Amino acid sequence: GVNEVPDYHEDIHTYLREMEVKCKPKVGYMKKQPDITNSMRAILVDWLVEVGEEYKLQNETLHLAVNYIDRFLSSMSVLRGKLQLVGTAAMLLASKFEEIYPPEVAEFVYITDDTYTKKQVLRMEHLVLKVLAFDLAAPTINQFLTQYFLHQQPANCKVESLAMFLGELSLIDADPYLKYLPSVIAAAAFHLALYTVTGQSWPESLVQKTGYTLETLKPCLLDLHQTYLRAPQHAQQSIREKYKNSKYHGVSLLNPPETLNL
Amino acid sequence: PPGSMENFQKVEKIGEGTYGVVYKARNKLTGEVVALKKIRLDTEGVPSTAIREISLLKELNHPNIVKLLDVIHTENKLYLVFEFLHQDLKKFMDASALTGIPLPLIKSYLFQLLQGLAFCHSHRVLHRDLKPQNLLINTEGAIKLADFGLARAFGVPVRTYTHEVVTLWYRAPEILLGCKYYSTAVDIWSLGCIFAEMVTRRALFPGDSEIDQLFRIFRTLGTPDEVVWPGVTSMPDYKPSFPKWARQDFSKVVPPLDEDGRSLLSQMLHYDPNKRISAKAALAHPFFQDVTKPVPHLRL
Ligand SMILES: Cc1c(C(=O)O)cccc1-c1nc2nc(N)nc(OCC3CCCCC3)c2[nH]1
Ligand SMILES: [Mg+2]
């Protein structure tokens, strides 16, 4: 029905495919950051996951914040003591963009345990907006996933939650996921979820829609599968905790498959 | 981008609202006439309406969508520089009392509004406030969607978004009836109301409250049941106690409208958001078979 905008679905998917290339962060940015590392970014993204749980923000909001941060850090050097300010301001902007009821600025100041002032948060907000030139309508893994989900026969809630979980895990690790576009991560996550739960594969209908095959998705899939297999041991655990909740069908408790048989 | 701000010469105030003054101004170097919307900054930082307006209009480049030219982004003020347009459709309707708007102009304007809207929808943007005051016309015959402060980037399939939304007279029944989800069809409902309004110069459903608005729609189009709109009786704010009004001939709803016009209007005002016509499909309606783009018949 009109909730899946049949007359526009394909125009939208095309347009998002075009924009994810323009909103892509620079793949080698961390190497050009003197003071920060992939591991500090992972700490930060894991903290944003907790903040989104504390305020019951949309997952889309989280994905947008991470995109904003990664684009900002692609052109702005940041000291480690200020990384969280960038992250706080990113989450504020994403909330304002995406949420019906965003938390107030004071709640963002509060959650940084008063490391930062309200003035600093609002000043960083303005700097992020200028650095990103207000281009906040970025495509996310989620926006692709939700369209891929329409191709399931029938829809399966475990598959959907699992795919979101896998996509969310990818946010944490810049190495390697920065080299992959949201549409590709979404595809690999959808395939991997579909396989884990039902034994099925990336369907022909999504080959038609995306132009992607298991062969073109292989590299991302192999990374994602390793990430999935190693997830209990990763230093960052907020996504796994989050996806134990019934809201997400407890999918983080499902066992990854040992092999992909590709 | 284009600087600026010392390059602009304010000519006069043209509008207000939030946050929220609009001036007419002229670029002193290029001669370009612009509309400057000033947004005062501060204790919650940059307002979310502005964040949406700007981010979404950066993506939307189209002849029938108001062009955002620049954003002048200072510590305490934010100016949005838009292309200048001469009048809003509402003031044009009022100026056209006595004659009415010639059909070629109504047809032209509807065709352009539908192009603008199809473009929004194709770029995953819901406008959510289409009304004559937000539609701007120039002296060359263009009409453009404007005021994107209520707009939103949507996902496919849609999630639950802000319930408010849409000025009451132009608000679709699935919003009035509290549906969990609404989509691109809400904008089409609004343009249907606007189509009718261009023909009559008076609002089609001028409700004074949500229930009154629903009841005015029901009295014109019939109180919807499960045949006309499967699911309606299960909607959150549907009440079995709602009066059951008979659907009128549509010829009686907008008497001066021809058969093609009526057909298109009835498809834009279909109760079932699933069956309501898209902007994309409306562009191909036989109503538009002879469409042109004349200038407005009146001085702007
Ligand atoms: C709107 C208007 C009148 C009028 O009908 O009173 C007279 C002279 C100019 C304008 C006007 N031209 C405009 N051009 C652009 N680009 N934007 C305008 O206003 C933005 C406005 C759109 C309608 C709701 C409030 C925000 C404009 N308002
Ligand atoms: Mg429809």
Give the distance, in angstroms, between the CA of residue B299 and the centroid of all CA atoms in the same chain.
23
Is residue A85 in a domain? yes
* Structural domain span for residue A108: 25-137
Q: Are residue A240 and residue A154 in the same domain, yes or no?
A: yes
Cα B141 to ligand 2 centre (Å) = 28
Q: What are the extents of the domains in chain B?
A: 5-86, 87-297
Q: How far apart are CA B160 and CA B181, in angstroms?
A: 5
Instruction: Confirm or reject contact between B71 and chain A (CB < 8 A).
Output: yes
Which protein residue has the closest C-alpha to ligand 1 atom 13?
B85
Residues B162/A99, Cβ–Cβ less than 8 Å: no
CATH of the domain at A230: 1.10.472.10
Tokens (6 digits) for A8: 């526009």
Q: CB distance from B31 to chain A under 8 Å? A: no
Angle between helices B48-59 and A83-98 (to 10 degrees): 80
Residues of A with CB under 8 A from a CB of B: 1-5, 7-9, 11-13, 15-16, 19, 58, 60, 92-93, 96-97, 100, 102, 104-105, 121-122, 125-126, 129-130, 133-137, 142-143, 146-147, 150
B124 contacts A12? CB cut-off 8 A: yes
In this structure, are A42 and A147 located in the same domain? no
Please give the Cα distance from A101 to A46 (Å, whole number).
Answer: 22
From A107, A137, A167, the end of a domain falls on: A137
In a domain, A223, yes or no: yes
Q: How many domains does chain A have?
A: 2
Q: Which atom of ligand 1 has the smallest separation from the CA of B90?
A: 5
Residue showing tokens 């900002």: A72
What is the amino acid identity at position A223? D
SS (H, E, C) chain B: CCCCCCCEEEEEEEEECCCEEEEEEEECCCCCEEEEEEEECCCCCCCHHHHHHHHHHHHCCCCCECCEEEEEECCCEEEEEEECCCEEHHHHHHHCCCCCCCHHHHHHHHHHHHHHHHHHHHCCEECCCCCHHHEEECCCCCEEECCCCCCEECCCCCCCCCCCCCCHHHCCHHHHCCCCCCCCHHHHHHHHHHHHHHHHCCCCCCCCCHHHHHHHHHHHHCCCCCCCCCCHHHCCCCCCCCCCCCCCCHHHCCCCCCHHHHHHHHHHCCCCCCCCCCHHHHCCCHHHCCCCCCCCCCCC
The number of beta carbons lying within 10 Å of the beta carbon of residue B152 is 21
Q: Are residues A31 and A130 in the same domain?
A: yes
Residue A135 tokens, joined: 């281009």
Residue range B87-297 in CATH 2.60.120.460: no
Name residue B279's amino acid: A
> Are both A70 and A110 inside the same structural domain?
yes
Choice among B42, B129, B249, B272 that is catalytic: B129
Q: Which two tokens stand for residue B272?
A: 């079932």
In a domain, A18, yes or no: yes
Between CA A105 and CA A121 the distance in angstroms is: 8
Same domain, A145 and A128: no
Same domain as A219, residue A97:
no
CB of B91 shorter than 6 A to ligand 1 = yes
Determine what percent of chain A falls in helix, strand and coil, rounding each to the nearest 5: 70, 0, 30
Domain boundary among A112, A137, A162: A137
Amino acid (1-letter code) at residue A210: T
Evaluate whether residue A6 is within a structural domain: no
A182-198 and A214-230 helices cross at what angle (nearest 10)? Answer: 70
Q: Give, using CA atoms, the residue closest to atom 25 of ligand 1.
A: B147
Tell me, yes or no, if B261 comes closer than 8 A to chain A by beta carbon. Answer: no
Question: Has residue A4 been placed in a domain?
Answer: no
Helix (H, G, I), strand (E, B) or coil at A104: coil
Say how many C-beta atoms besides its own lie within 10 A of residue A117's C-beta: 12
Residues A149 and A59 in one domain: no
Determine the Cα–Cα distance for residues B32 and B213; give it in Å rounded to an integer: 42
- Cα B278 from Cα B147, distance rounded (Å): 21
Q: Are residues A142 and A252 in the same domain?
A: yes
Q: In whole angstroms, what is the distance from residue A20 CA to residue A142 CA? A: 12
User: Are A40 and A61 part of one and the same domain?
Assistant: yes
Residue A60: closest CA among A136, A6, A132: A136
Distance from CA of B115 to the nearest CA of A (A): 13
Residue B181 burial (C-beta neighbours within 10 Å; 0-12, 13-18, 19+): middle
Residue A65 within any structural domain of the chain: yes
First to last CA, chain A: 36
Q: φ and ψ at A144, to 5 degrees?
A: -75, -45
Query: Based on the domain organization, do A20 and A142 belong to the same domain?
Result: yes
Distance separating alpha carbons of residues A117 and A108, to the nearest angstrom:
10
Structural domain includes residue A1:
no
> Do residue A33 and residue A15 come from a single domain?
no
The residue out of A137, A163, A188 marking a domain boundary is A137
Paired with B161 in beta bridges are none
**Taking CB atoms and an 8 Å limit, are B71 and A134 in contact across chains?**
yes
Q: Verify that A207 and A119 share a domain, yes or no.
A: no
- Residue A58 in domain: yes
Task: Tell how far the Cα of B144 is from the centroid of ligand 1, in angstroms.
Answer: 11
**Strands B20-27 vs B8-16: parallel, antiparallel or unpaired:** antiparallel
Q: Would you identify the CATH topology of the domain B5-86?
A: Phosphorylase Kinase; domain 1 (3.30.200)
Rg of the Cα atoms in chain A:
18
